[PDB]
Amino acid sequence: KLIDQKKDKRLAYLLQQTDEYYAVAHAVTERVDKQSALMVNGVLKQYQIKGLEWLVSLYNNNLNGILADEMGLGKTIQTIALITYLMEHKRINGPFLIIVPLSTLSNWAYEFDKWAPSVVKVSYKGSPAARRAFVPQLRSGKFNVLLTTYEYIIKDKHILAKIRWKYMIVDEGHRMKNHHCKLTQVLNTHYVAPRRLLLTGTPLQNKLPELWALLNFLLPTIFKSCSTFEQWFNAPFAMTGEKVDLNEEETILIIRRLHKVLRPFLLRRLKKEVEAQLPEKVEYVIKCDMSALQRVLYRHMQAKGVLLTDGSGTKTLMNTIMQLRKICNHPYMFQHIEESFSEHLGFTGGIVQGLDLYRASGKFELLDRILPKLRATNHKVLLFCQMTSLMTIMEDYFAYRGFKYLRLDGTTKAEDRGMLLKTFNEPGSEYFIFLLSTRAGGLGLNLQSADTVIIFDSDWNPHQDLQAQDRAHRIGQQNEVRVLRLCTVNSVEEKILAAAKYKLNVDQKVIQAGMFDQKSSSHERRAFLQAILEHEEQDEEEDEVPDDETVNQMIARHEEEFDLFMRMDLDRRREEARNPKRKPRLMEEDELPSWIIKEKMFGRGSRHRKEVDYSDS
Amino acid sequence: AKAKTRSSRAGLQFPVGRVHRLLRKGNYAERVGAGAPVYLAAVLEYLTAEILELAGNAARDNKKTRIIPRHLQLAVRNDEELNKLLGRVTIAQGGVLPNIQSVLLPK
Amino acid sequence: AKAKTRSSRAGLQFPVGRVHRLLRKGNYAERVGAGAPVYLAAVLEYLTAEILELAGNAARDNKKTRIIPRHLQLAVRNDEELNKLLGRVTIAQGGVLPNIQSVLLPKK
Amino acid sequence: KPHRYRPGTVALREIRRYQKSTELLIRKLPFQRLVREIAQDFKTDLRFQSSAVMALQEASEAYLVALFEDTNLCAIHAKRVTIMPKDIQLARRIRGER
Amino acid sequence: RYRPGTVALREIRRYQKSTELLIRKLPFQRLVREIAQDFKTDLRFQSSAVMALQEASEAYLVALFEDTNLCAIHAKRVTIMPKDIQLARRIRGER
Amino acid sequence: AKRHRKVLRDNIQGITKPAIRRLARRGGVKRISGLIYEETRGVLKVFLENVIRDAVTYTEHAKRKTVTAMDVVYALKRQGRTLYGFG
Amino acid sequence: RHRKVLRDNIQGITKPAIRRLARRGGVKRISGLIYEETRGVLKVFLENVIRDAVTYTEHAKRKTVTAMDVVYALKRQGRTLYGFGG
Amino acid sequence: SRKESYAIYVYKVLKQVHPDTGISSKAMSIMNSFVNDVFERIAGEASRLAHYNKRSTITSREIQTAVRLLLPGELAKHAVSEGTKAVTKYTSA
Amino acid sequence: SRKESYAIYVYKVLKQVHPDTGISSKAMSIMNSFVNDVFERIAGEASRLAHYNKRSTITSREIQTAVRLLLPGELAKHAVSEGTKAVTKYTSA
DNA sequence: GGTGCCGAGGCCGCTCAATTGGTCGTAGACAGCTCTAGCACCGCTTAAACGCACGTACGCGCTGTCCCCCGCGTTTTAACCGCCAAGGGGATTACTCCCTAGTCTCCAGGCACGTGTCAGATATATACATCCTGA
DNA sequence: TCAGGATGTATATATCTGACACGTGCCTGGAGACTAGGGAGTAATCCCCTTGGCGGTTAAAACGCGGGGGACAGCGCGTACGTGCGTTTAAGCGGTGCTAGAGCTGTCTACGACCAATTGAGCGGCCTCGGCACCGG
Ligand SMILES: Nc1ncnc2c1ncn2[C@@H]1O[C@H](COP(=O)(O)OP(=O)(O)O)[C@@H](O)[C@H]1O
Ligand code: BEF
Ligand SMILES: [Mg+2]
Hints:
heterononamer, D: about 100 residues, mainly alpha, Histone, subunit A, 3 helices, 2 strands, F: about 90 residues, 4 helices, about 5% strand, flat, binds adenosine-5'-diphosphate, binds beryllium trifluoride ion, binds magnesium ion, DNA-binding, nucleosome core (chain C), ubl conjugation (chain C), nucleus (chain C), chromosome (chain C), hydroxylation (chain G)
C-alpha cells in the first residue's frame, strides 16, 4: 500500500520548492485583509474576504492554487480583490495577465470599471489592425492589467510572451484538461509568469487524470514531475459498482489520502452552506413521446444504420449515435426528410413552416404546451441546445408563435455578444427567451434575470450541463429556479443521460467529498463519504412516463399558478375538438416512401449492344 | 472408375487442366488453388465467345463465310468495351475503320 | 568461422544479402544465381549515387544543405537520362521545372 | 486615377514566385469532400486514411498541371494565347484518354 | 479532269477499305538490315521477323497520321505540316 | 431561411475558379477562357473515379473498410502513374 | 563473300508510299516537307525496336532474329502485336 | 516436337455461336495470341494481389479481383458471373 | 513491429558523394521508393527473360541484359560497368 | 539580423536475419549430329516510281471590330486550426484443420500427318451512280 | 437547280486452286487415389485513429465595375500541291543450289536449395543540437 512513503516526498518539494502538511506549505500567515480594501465601490461578502485570505497566503508562500468555488459565488470579484490588494499592501504594480473565454471578456471589463476604476487595463481584442495599436502602450508598460482570450494567447504569442508577467490568471481552466493542449504548450514555454492561478467551477471532468494536468500546469515539477508519474490510484477504475473506485479491497483510506495531498492548494466553496439565502434550485427530467416519423426513422437507423430516403432507396450515414441523437431532436435536421415532406404535406416546397414542426418532433410538442404557459406568468426562460442546426429549426417555430427571442450562439460576432447580454438583462425587457449553445453560452455569463432553464438535450459529460444550469442560479437571483431537462423515452438519450450520471460519481469522491472550505476540517468528510455508497442501491429504473398532468405541477411553484395553469389547458382541449387533427404525427402523413418501404445483369446473354454497320457499302 | 475431365465437370470448352499447369509453371505464386484454374478458364472462354460473335456478324455483313483478320479488327474496334481492352494492341492485316473528318468533305 | 558480409567482399554499400532474399521471395524464378544479387545491388547503388549527387548539386545552388523533394525533382528532370528513366513517375512535393513559352512573354 | 497594371503582366508575375513553389494549389477540405462523394458510388460506409487523401490530391494536381502544359501548346499551335475547352479535348485525345 | 481534292477523297476511301502493306517489301527489308548492322554484324532475319517489323511500323505511321491530321484541323488547315507531326509526338510523350 | 443555400453547394464546385487558375499558372498558361473551369471540373472528376474505383477494389479484396495510402499507390501504378513519397 | 555495308536505304521509303500511308490515316492534303519528316520518324521508331530485338537475340546466344524477338521487343515499347505467335 | 495452342478450343467455341461460319489460319493465329495475352494479364495481376496481401496462394478470389481490375466496366460484370457459375457447377459435382 | 527500408544504405552513399549535406525525411522516403521501383523493374524483366529461354535460374547474365533493356543509353553503359566490377571482385575474394 | 525550434543526426539495447558449413541431386554445359530455312543467284515481265507542267485551291498576312477577359476593390464566406466526444476497425496472437503439393498409376485427349474439296479471288460483260461542264 | 457525257462504282457468272476441315495413329500429359504438412481461416483482444460536431479568426473567395487586348471574320495575294501524261527503274516471281545455324540427344558435374547453429547488423527509441524559417528592416 505504501501510502505513507509517498506523501513524504511531497513534503520535500514544498520545503525545497518554497525556498528561492498544510502548515509547512503555509509558512507565512497574514490576517490583515479584514481591513477595508480601498478603491472599490461595492462591499465584499464575508466569505469572499476569507477567500482573499487564502489567496494572499499563496502569494506569501509562493504558491499556485485553484479557486475552485461553485459556479455562482462571485469568482470574478475575488480575483479583482487580489489585484487591488497587491497594488496597495505589496505596492507592486505588475502587468497582471488574465485569460478569459471570449463571451466573458465584456463582463470582466465591466467589473473593473465599477470595482476598481483606478486600475489601468487594456482589453486586448479585435482585428489585427486594432491589436497592433496596443503595442506602443505594451512596451512602455503603463498598463496594470491585460485581458485576452484563449485564441490571442496563441495567435499573438510573439508579442505577448515578450512581456514579463508578475502574475498570470486563467479563467474557466477547463481548457487545460488535455495535457497535449496547444494552449498549455504555448503558455508554459513561451510565457514566463512565476505566480499562476486558475478559476473553475468544475475542477475535474469525467476523468481523474485531467485534474493532474491542471496541477501539473500550476506546479510543474514541485507538485510532482511528469516523468516520475507514479500515482495514488495507479490505475483508472470505472465499473457499474460505484462503491469501489480503485483496484483495492474495499479500502476508504486511499481516497482519504488524496484529499490530504491536494488540500493545501484548492479552495472549494458550496452554494448551500456559504450562501443560504438563494432559492432551492429544483431540477426535473421530463420524458417525451416519439412521433411517428421519428419512430420509423429511429428504428431503421438503429437496426440497419441507414437513413430512409425517397426513390430519387436509402443513405448510409456514418456516426450512428450522432444521427440517432439528431433524430430524437428533430427529424427535419436531415434536410432530405424535410424537403420530401415540404412537397407531400401539401404546401410550398423547400423551407417548411407551420404546425408540422409543432407535430414533427415530440420535444417541440411539449415545448408548445410549456412556453405559452410560462409567457403568462411573465417568466423569462433561457434555453440551451447542443447542435446549431437545431436552432435554425427552433428559430422558425419561434416566429410562428411570434415569441420574442435572442440567439447568442457560436459564430455570432464578438462585438454583438456584449449587447445581447445587455438587452436581455435590461429591466422591463420585452424578450421572453434567449437561445444559447451549451459550449458558447454555458461559460461565465450572468443571465440572472431568467428564473427557469430548459435543457433541450444533454451533453456527454454532465459538468457541461451543470454550467448551463448555473447561468441563472447565481448571486443576484431572487426567484425560485427550475431546470427542465427534456429527454426522449426509449431512445439513446437515456444511455447518454445514464452514462453522464456515472461520470458524476468520480468527482463526488474526490472534489465534493473533500470539502476544501477550510472550515469542515472535522470528520464530516467521512460522514459524507460513507453516505455515498448506500444511495446507489436505492435507484429504480423508470420508463414510459410522460406524466401528462404532472408537467404543469412541475412548472408551477404556487397554487395560484395552477388556477392560471388550469385555464389554458382545457381551452386547448375545447379548441382542438373543432378540427380533429392528431396533436402528434400519429401515422397521419407517413404515406411518404419511408413507411412504404417497411446496369448489372447476367453473363454472355444480357450484354446490351448497339447494332453495328460492318457492311460499309 | 471412369475418368471425367475437369472442363466437362465445370461445363466448359476450354482446357481447365492445361490452365492449371500454366499457372503452376508460370511462377505466379508458391501455391495454386483448386478453383483458380476453373474460374480463369471460364473467363477466357467468355472473352473468346464474345469476340467471335461480333467477328462472325462482321463476316456475314460482308457476305463471307470465313473469319479473316479484317473481321476481327472490325469487331473489336467497333465495340466500346473491347476497344478499351485492346487499346494498345495492333492486329496484323486488320486495317482501319473507314472514317473521314467532316471538315474534309466537300461543301 | 569469422563472419564477413557479402557486401564488403564485393566492395558495396548495399545489402547483397537482403537483395538475395528479395529475389528468392518474389517468385521471379525457381533458382537464383550466386552472382545475381551482387550484380543487382551494384546497379542499384550506382543509380542511387547518380541521383544523390545531382540532387546534392541542386541543394548548393539554392545555398541550402539539405535535400528536399524539390531538389530530387530538379535533378531528375534536368538530366535527360534520368528523366527518361522516370518519365511516368510523379514525385510528391516536387513541383515543376520553371519554363515559360517564348510567345507568352513580351518581346518588343 | 489609381495605378493599374496592364493586362497580362500580373498573370505573368507567377514566373518569379508562383511556379517555383511546391505546395498543393487546391484547398484540403473541398477536395476531401469531393473524394468521399465519388467513393459513395462504388462502396458505402468507406473510411479514408489521412495520408490516403493526400496521395489522391498529390496525383490529381500533378495530372492537371501536366494537362495544362499540353493544353497550352495546342493553343499556341493555333496561333493564340487563350486556352479554350477545344484545346483540352485535343490534348486528351492525342494522349488516348478520349 | 477532276477538281483538285476529289481524287484524294477517292484514294482515302480506297485505302481505308484494304489491308495490305503500303510499302514495297524489298526496300523495307534492306532498311531493316542496315539498321541492325549498327548493333551487331552478321545477323540474320526470319521472314516473319521482317514482316512483323513492317506490320508494326505501318500501324505506327498510320496512327501517327491520324493524330497529325487533327492538329492540322485544329489550326484551321487541311494540309499537314511538319509542325503538326512534332506537336502530335510532343503530346504523346515521344519528345 | 438560410438552410436552402447550404445544400446548393455541389461540392464539385468546391474546386473554385481561383484554384483552377493556380494550377493553370503552374502549367504556364497566360490567359484562360471562361469555359475552362467547367471543362476542367469534368476532367478532374473522370480522373478521380478511375483511380478511386481501383483503390476501392484493392481495399475490398483485403477485407478492409478503410482505404489506405498503399491502395492509392497501387491503383496509380496500375494506370502507369507511379507516385513516390507515400511508401 | 564479302558483305557490303548498306547505305542510304531510307530513301527506299518513297514519296508515293508515304502518301498512301497518309491516305489510310485520312489525310487529304500533304505538304512537301512531310516526306523527310516521316523518314526521320520511321527511322527513330524502327531503331528502338531493332535495338531490343537484337538484345533479346544475343542474350539467347543466337545469330538469327526471330519473330518472337520482334514481338517481345514491341511488347516492351507498350505496343502488342497479334498474329505472329505468343 | 509439338506446339501447344488454343486452336481446337477456339474452334469449338466458334461452332457454338456461328455453326456455319469458319475461321482462317491467320485469324486463328490472332485468336491464339489474344488468349495468351489476356491469360497473362489476369495471372500477372492476380500474382501481385497475393503479394500485396502476403498470401502464398492464388485462389478464385484473386482471379475474380484481377478480372474486376482489368476488364472495362460492363464487360467485367459478365465475366465475373461466368466464372462464378463455372466454379459453382464444378464444386457441386 | 519492424519495417525494413533502404534508408541507412542510401545515407551511406550520400556521405560518399556529399560528405556534409543531409537529406530530409520526405526526400528519404522518395529515395526509398525509387530503389524499390528500380529493383522490381529489373527483377521483373530478368524473370521474364529467363522464361523466354526456358531456363529456371536467374544469373548475373539475365541481370546484365535486363539493365540494357531498361536503362537508356549512357546510363546502361555505366551500370553494366559497375555490376561487372562488383562480380569479379566478389568472385576473386 | 537576429531569435527561435522543429526536424534531423547521433547513441544505445535487443533481437532476428544473414553467415558459415555440409549434402544432395538436378539444371546447365558440352559434344555430336541432323536437316531446314535463310541467303544468294538468275532472268523476266511489268507494275510502280519518277519526272514535267499546268492551273488552282489554299496558306497566310493584314485590317477592323467588339466583347470577353483581366484587374481592382469591397464585402462575405468558409477553410483552418483548436477542441469536444465516442467506437469502428486495424492490427496482432493462438489454435487447428483442410487444402495443396507430391507421388505413382493408368489412359485418353490432342498433336502431327495425310487427304479431299470447296470458299473466295480473278477475269468478262454490263447497267447504274458520281463528277465536271454547260445552262 | 437540271441536263449530258465521261469515268468510275457496283453486279451477275464461270472456274480454279490452295487452304480449310476431317480422319488416323499414338504418346505424353492429365486424371484418380494416396499421404504428410503447413497456410490460412477463425476467434479473441487491444487501442489507434477515424468520424461528426462546435468555436472563433482571417485569408481567400465572390461580386461588381471598367477598360482594352485579343479573338475572329473578311479580303487579297501568290505559292506550292494536286492531276495527269509519258518515261524509266526496279520490285515481285519462279525457280535453283549452298550451307550455316538451330534443334535434338546423351552424358556429366558443379552449383544452388535445404537444413542447422550462431551472433552481430539493423531497427526502435532516446537525447541534442543546428539548419532553416521568420519577424523586421
Ligand atoms: N460583493 C458583491 N457585490 C455584488 N455582486 C456580487 C458580489 N460578489 C459577487 N457578485 C455577483 O456574483 C456574480 C458572479 O461573479 P463571478 O466572479 O463571475 O463568479 P462566477 O465566475 O462564479 O460567476 C456576478 O454577477 C456578481 O454581480
Ligand atoms: F463560475 Be462563473 F459561471 F464564472
Ligand atoms: Mg467567472
